[PDB]
Design a protein around this ligand. Structure first.
Ligand SMILES: *[C@@H]1O[C@H](CO)[C@@H](O)[C@H](O)[C@H]1NC(C)=O
Lengths: 50, 39
């Protein structure tokens, strides 16, 4: 109650501007020659990768 | 686009596309621009 304490405060905000600041993006392995779904950097679809 | 040009005093009669280099999320407006030289 009388000992030093270190304090850190984080603030966020939004407005009419590009985000340009985002956190981690997870990833999976790559498979071929099988009917599989895919998400290749924002593009979604289903097919066979060759 | 960097095009090697033969000896000529005018823009050549040809076609050449311009590839993109970089995109910057600045979100600012532009109305005037200038030139810079070295001496
Ligand atoms: C640039 O100025 C114009 C008016 O001069 C304004 O409409 C526009 O929103 C401005 N863009 C900015 C500040 O990014």
């Amino acid at each position: 109650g009388h000992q030093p304490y270190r304090v850190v405060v984080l603030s966020f905000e939004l407005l009419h501007a590009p985000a340009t600041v985002c956190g981690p993006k997870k990833s999976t392995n790559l498979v071929k020659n099988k009917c599989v779904n895919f998400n290749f950097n924002g593009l979604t679809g289903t097919g066979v990768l060759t | 686009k960097h095009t090697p040009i033969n000896l000529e005093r005018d823009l050549p009669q040809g076609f050449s596309a311009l590839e993109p280099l970089v995109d910057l999320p600045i979100g600012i407006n532009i109305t005037r621009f200038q030139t810079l030289l070295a001496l």
